[PDB]
């Protein structure tokens, strides 16, 4: 039937319905820190989330999304490698069944316990559905999670997960501040890539932060209690919802720092 992360419908199968899976600019990738080139002409990132308006949290059967009002310039990303203004639409995570795996990007082949994706679309294209059809349509800010001390700013998300256990459930989720999920440094690597789930469209400028955030064992354990299935269907835990690293091909990863 349809795509997912199991033995019979996982990443190795996606190319049959989505041939772009074997394309020229697929994500995620391994970030080889010694091969990445410092680019002194790259600007500092500008993350402007003070006016962000969260609305809802949704289990979509693949992850959970915290969704934002993107009908005005309320929470925007600019600068760095980007030309123009990109509006925050949603964030979500990918995570593992074990602390030793779960991230999509890797760093010198190292896997982190999870990865946060803050998804933004280029305002010159008018809406998200048009943006994904463009080579410079999206900017995704990727942040690694390691297991250690708790992240206080994540706790409001963890506590609502019981109310969206199964595919298709949603809950009101207002007044959440995504600034509480950011590390101290905004040093980053950047490369042109794709969505990491079907439809795997090649529309993303990836900006991956060098500094991970730490979350507690209890926080990530709660992610692992979510379900891929709908209510009343056989229970399958939502774990290991990550795509592995794809070939770099004809691309260079640039660093904002040395
Ligand atoms: N995982 S990802 O590339 O950030 C992604 C973002 C939006 C839709 C589908 C995938
Ligand atoms: Zn993602």
Curated annotation (Swiss-Prot):
Stated name of the protein: Carbonic anhydrase 2
Outcome of swapping residue 92 to C/D/E/N/Q: Strongly reduced CO(2) hydrase and p-nitrophenyl acetate esterase activities, impaired stability of zinc binding
Organism: Homo sapiens
Outcome of mutating residue 142 to R: In OPTB3; complete loss of activity
A GO CC term attached to the entry: myelin sheath
Cofactor(s) listed in the protein's UniProt record: Zn(2+); Co(2+)
GO MF, one annotated term: arylesterase activity
Chain sites annotated for binding Zn(2+): 92, 94, 117
Record's keyword annotation contains Cytoplasm: yes
Effect noted on mutating residue 115 to Q: Strongly reduced activity and sulfonamide affinity
Signal peptide as annotated in the record: none
Effect ascribed to mutating residue 140 to F/Y: Strongly impaired activity
Site (Fine-tunes the proton-transfer properties of H-64): 5, 60, 65
Active-site residues annotated for this sequence: 62 (proton donor/acceptor)
């Amino acid at each position: 039937h349809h795509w997912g992360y199991g033995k019979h419908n996982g990443p190795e199968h996606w190319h049959k319905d989505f041939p772009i899976a074997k394309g020229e600019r697929q994500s995620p990738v391994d970030i080889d820190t010694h091969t990445a080139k410092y680019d002194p002409s790259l600007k500092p990132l500008s993350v402007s989330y003070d006016q962000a308006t969260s609305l809802r949290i949704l289990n979509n059967g693949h992850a959970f999304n915290v969704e934002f009002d993107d009908s005005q310039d309320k929470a925007v990303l600019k600068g760095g490698p980007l030309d123009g203004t990109y509006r925050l639409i949603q964030f979500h995570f990918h995570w593992g069944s074990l602390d030793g795996q779960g991230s999509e990007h890797t760093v010198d082949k190292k896997k982190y316990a999870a990865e946060l994706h803050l998804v933004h679309w280029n305002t010159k294209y008018g809406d998200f559905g048009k943006a994904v059809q463009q080579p410079d349509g999206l900017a995704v800010l990727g942040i690694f999670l390691k297991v250690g001390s708790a992240k206080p700013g994540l706790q409001k998300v963890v506590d609502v997960l019981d109310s969206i256990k199964t595919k298709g459930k949603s809950a009101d989720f207002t007044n959440f501040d995504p600034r509480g999920l950011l590390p101290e440094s905004l040093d980053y690597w950047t490369y042109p890539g794709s969505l990491t789930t079907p439809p795997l469209l090649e529309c993303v400028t990836w900006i991956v932060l060098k500094e991970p955030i730490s979350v507690s064992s209890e926080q990530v354990l709660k992610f692992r209690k979510l379900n891929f299935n709908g209510e009343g269907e056989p229970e399958e835990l939502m774990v290991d919802n990550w795509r592995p690293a794809q070939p770099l091909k004809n691309r260079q990863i640039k660093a904002s720092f040395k």
